[PDB]
A paper describes a structure:
The first committed reaction in grindelic acid biosynthesis is the transformation of the core diterpenoid precursor geranylgeranyl diphosphate (GGPP) into the bicyclic intermediate 7,13-copalyl diphosphate (7,13-CPP) catalyzed by the class II diterpene synthase (diTPS) Grindelia robusta TPS2 (GrTPS2). All class II diTPS share a common three-domain (γβα) fold with the active site being formed by the N-terminal γ and β domains. A conserved catalytic DxDD motif controls the general acid-base mechanism to bring about the cyclization of GGPP with the middle Asp residue functioning as the general acid.
The GrTPS2 crystal structure adopts the conserved three-domain fold of class II diterpene synthases featuring a functional active site in the γβ-domain and a vestigial ɑ-domain. Consistent with other class II diTPSs, the C-terminal α-domain lacks helices α1 and G1 and helices D, F, H, and I are shorter as compared to class I diTPSs resulting in a non-functional class I active site. The GrTPS2 class II active site is formed by the γ- and β-domains, which adopt the typical ɑ-barrel structure and closely resemble the AtCPS active site. By contrast, a His-Asn dyad, previously shown to be important for catalytic specificity in AtCPS and other ent-CPP synthases, is replaced with Tyr (Y209) and Thr (T268) residues located at the top of the active site. While the removal of a larger side chain through Ala substitution resulted in a nearly complete loss of function, exchange to His or Phe showed activity loss to a lesser extent and increased production of 8,13-CPP, suggesting that the hydroxyl group of Y457 and presence of an aromatic ring in this position make an important contribution to directing catalysis toward deprotonation of labda-13-en-8-yl+ at the endocyclic C-7 methylene to form 7,13-CPP.
Numbering used by the authors: 19 to 562, 567 to 733
């Protein structure tokens, strides 16, 4: 029912301006991205506030602004912590630390007492909390706070069942510490250094990160300074205390983690094309500080992790930067993958992100093939066992995200399909991550991305629905013998779900009509039992014998379509493409003489897209050696796919797609233009998609992508 007021042109115009305004808003907010924008932590701020004046000014703290920040942040119930997501351990850590800091420096006894009232009242309720919910290191960090409080004469209930139980778990964890390794190399243990004893600072001080911190943790670095007076540790804290007006987060910097996840989310939400300038800058930064040993959450932290590594790897490769899969060997041992030494990569989202990285593999990258099998099995079982949850991330629909990954390989993840599902899963402001304490990444998880992405999608969807009506009319006006069948909608959807942008209507519509006519021509060849000689005559009429009234009507219908396509393409660029389209169809039609009729369809579609877009003339494809190469791989690939039948997609097809991926994303300065290259992958995926899913699933995809507005 496109007679409504919402499909009117004036309404569509206002939506575009509204979308453009939101895009400019995001763009200005993204211009402020620097070293990381994280939740500030009262726990870490309190630890920094404990530092005594370094020039001997007895009775005064070194960082008074930290104490003032703490004062300003107390919640109405007397606690400190994440205001909107309540977590008992988060509140207890942030609150007792704040009380201890303020007590040490004799500040606001009224605030201290409200704070202690909350701690003492919620201490006993730790009994009612199971083991798997206690935040990382709590059994080490909270007892340490109790120790500091007792020495300030804050009396605690040490006979409480809750604390007797807590201190028991502290004792076992401390007994499990591998002291030698912990003192020999950077480990995740340094991030919780303040909760440990049995320290040989002679060796630990060799493990400082490049910015002078211990694992980029202000609390651990403040603890280290008070134990050792290390001047590098003090410099890290001084710079940090000046950047956020006293309040500090639970780790800093976080530039790699933040900028990588920005690119990922914008890409998955389907609006990354609006931020190519900003995304190119982010990816540039990621590549500049890429390391063959892996990357951390900060370029200046000395502990790489598999999650940052797997996400930066995938983002860098799909952006065209050369990166070796050998990096993952630093996170693999005896057939198992690890976040870092001592911590298996047992988290769902980490395995989710690893599975995603493994699928961009090139031929011969066995470690990525091992990772794919490993992660796919891990995730499939957590889905079957009804366990798709991460104890250390509060998100909206982690199950849906994992389900989509297992149901839709990357080779079959059409752009609009990926976005359509993620738009219902992305949490916006609601994503709360769990480290020592709860924190939020505003540049990664916010409601403005989601709202803008939903508006853009439903807007493109309105354009698609209008184009679909136009395609139905164009086909019927070519009254030859056929009707609007299911295959006609598939032919448009295949184009619209990949090249979806409203401004790219010429490419999308030309591809859609080409699918339709390829379907019609090949069906005609079959029904009429046309020989090679018959097809030969069919070609001569197209360009300049030929018999059969229906033959002449198909040739004219083809030529009229090509004339119309090139007509509309004049608005994009000025070069007349009709001769080149005729040549491309001549080449395909002649290929139907010598072999299967799907042998060169992919080349025909790709050339049509490159011509209507104008990329065939922006770059001299001509005899660039990669042109013949990518054309042959793609034709062979889509030959294997469309003519696989009822076989399953086997190893040979997977390997050929890997060949294409390697060519497409191995950008060189003198290589074929990347945008031209990526078109071949776009079409190949659309062939893979059609061979991977059954009819009923395709239909369900079509309804959701094209006809279900995003709520």
């Amino acid at each position: 029912q496109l007679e409504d007021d919402k499909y009117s042109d004036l309404q569509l115009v206002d939506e575009k301006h509204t979308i453009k305004r939101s895009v400019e808003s995001i763009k200005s907010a993204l211009s402020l991205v620097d070293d990381g924008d994280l939740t500030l932590s009262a726990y870490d701020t309190a630890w920094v506030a404990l530092i005594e004046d370094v020039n001997g000014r007895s009775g005064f703290p070194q960082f008074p602004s930290c104490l003032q920040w703490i004062v300003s942040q107390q919640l109405p119930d007397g606690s400190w912590g994440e205001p909107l997501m309540f977590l008992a351990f988060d509140r207890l850590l942030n609150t007792l630390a704040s009380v201890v800091a303020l007590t040490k420096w004799n500040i606001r006894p009224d605030i201290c007492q409200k704070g202690m009232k909350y701690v003492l009242e919620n201490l006993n309720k730790l009994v009612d909390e199971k083991e798997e919910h206690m935040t990382p290191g709590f059994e080490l960090l909270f007892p340490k706070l109790i120790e500091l409080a007792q020495k300030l004469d804050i009396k605690m209930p040490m006979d409480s069942p809750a604390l007797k139980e807590l201190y028991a778990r502290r004792d076992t964890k401390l007994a499990k510490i591998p002291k030698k390794i912990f003192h020999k190399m950077p480990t995740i243990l340094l991030y919780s250094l303040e909760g440990m004893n049995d320290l040989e600072w002679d060796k630990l001080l060799k493990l400082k990160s490049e910015n002078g911190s211990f694992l980029c943790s202000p609390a651990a670095t403040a603890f280290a300074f008070m134990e050792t007076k290390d001047q590098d540790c003090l410099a890290y804290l001084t710079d940090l205390v000046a950047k956020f007006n006293g309040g500090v987060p639970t780790f800093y910097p976080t530039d790699m983690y933040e900028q990588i996840w920005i690119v990922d989310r914008l890409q998955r939400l389907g609006i990354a094309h609006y931020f190519s300038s900003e995304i190119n800058n982010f990816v540039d930064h990621i590549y500049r500080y890429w390391d063959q040993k892996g990357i951390s959450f900060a370029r200046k932290c000395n502990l790489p992790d598999i999650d940052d590594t797997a996400m930066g790897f995938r983002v860098l490769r799909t952006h065209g930067y050369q990166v070796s899969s050998d990096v993952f060997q630093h996170f693999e041992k005896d057939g198992q993958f690890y976040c870092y030494w001592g911590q298996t990569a047992e988290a769902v989202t980490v395995m989710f992100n690893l599975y995603r990285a493994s699928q961009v593999l090139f031929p011969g990258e066995k470690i990525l093939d091992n990772a794919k099998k490993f992660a796919h099995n891990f995730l499939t079982e957590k889905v079957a066992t009804n366990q798709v949850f991460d104890k250390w991330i509060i998100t909206k629909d982690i199950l849906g995200e994992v389900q989509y990954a297992l149901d839709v390989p990357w080779y079959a993840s059409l752009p609009r399909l990926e976005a359509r599902y993620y738009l219902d899963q992305y949490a916006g402001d609601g994503d709360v991550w769990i480290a020592k304490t709860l924190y939020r990444l505003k540049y990664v998880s916010n409601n403005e991305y989601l709202e803008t992405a939903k508006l853009d999608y439903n807007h493109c969807q309105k354009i698609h629905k209008l184009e679909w009506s136009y395609i139905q009319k164009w086909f019927l006006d070519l009254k030859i013998e056929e009707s609007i069948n299911t295959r006609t909608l598939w032919s448009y959807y295949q184009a619209a779900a990949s090249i979806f942008h409203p401004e790219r209507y010429n490419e999308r519509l030309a591809w859609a009509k080409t699918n339709v006519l390829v379907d019609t021509i090949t069906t005609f060849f079959s029904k009429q039992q046309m020989s090679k000689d018959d097809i030969q005559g069919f070609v001569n009429q197209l360009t300049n014998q030929t018999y059969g009234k229906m033959s002449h009507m198909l040739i004219d219908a083809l030529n009229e379509t090509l004339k119309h396509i090139s007509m509309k393409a004049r608005e994009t660029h000025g070069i007349d493409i009709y001769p080149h389209l005729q040549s491309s169809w001549k080449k395909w039609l002649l290929s139907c003489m010598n072999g299967p009729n799907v042998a060169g369809v992919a080349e025909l579609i790709v050339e049509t897209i490159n011509l209507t877009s104008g990329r065939s003339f922006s770059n001299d494809l001509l005899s660039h050696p990669q042109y013949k190469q990518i054309t042959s791989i793609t034709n062979d690939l889509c030959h294997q796919l469309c003519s696989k039948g009822n076989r399953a997609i086997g190893s040979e097809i997977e390997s050929k797609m890997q060949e294409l991926v390697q060519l497409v994303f191995s950008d060189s300065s003198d290589g074929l233009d990347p945008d031209v290259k990526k078109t071949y992958l776009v079409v190949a995926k659309s062939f893979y998609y059609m061979a991977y899913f059954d009819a009923k699933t395709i239909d369900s995809h079509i309804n959701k992508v094209l006809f279900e507005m995003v709520v």
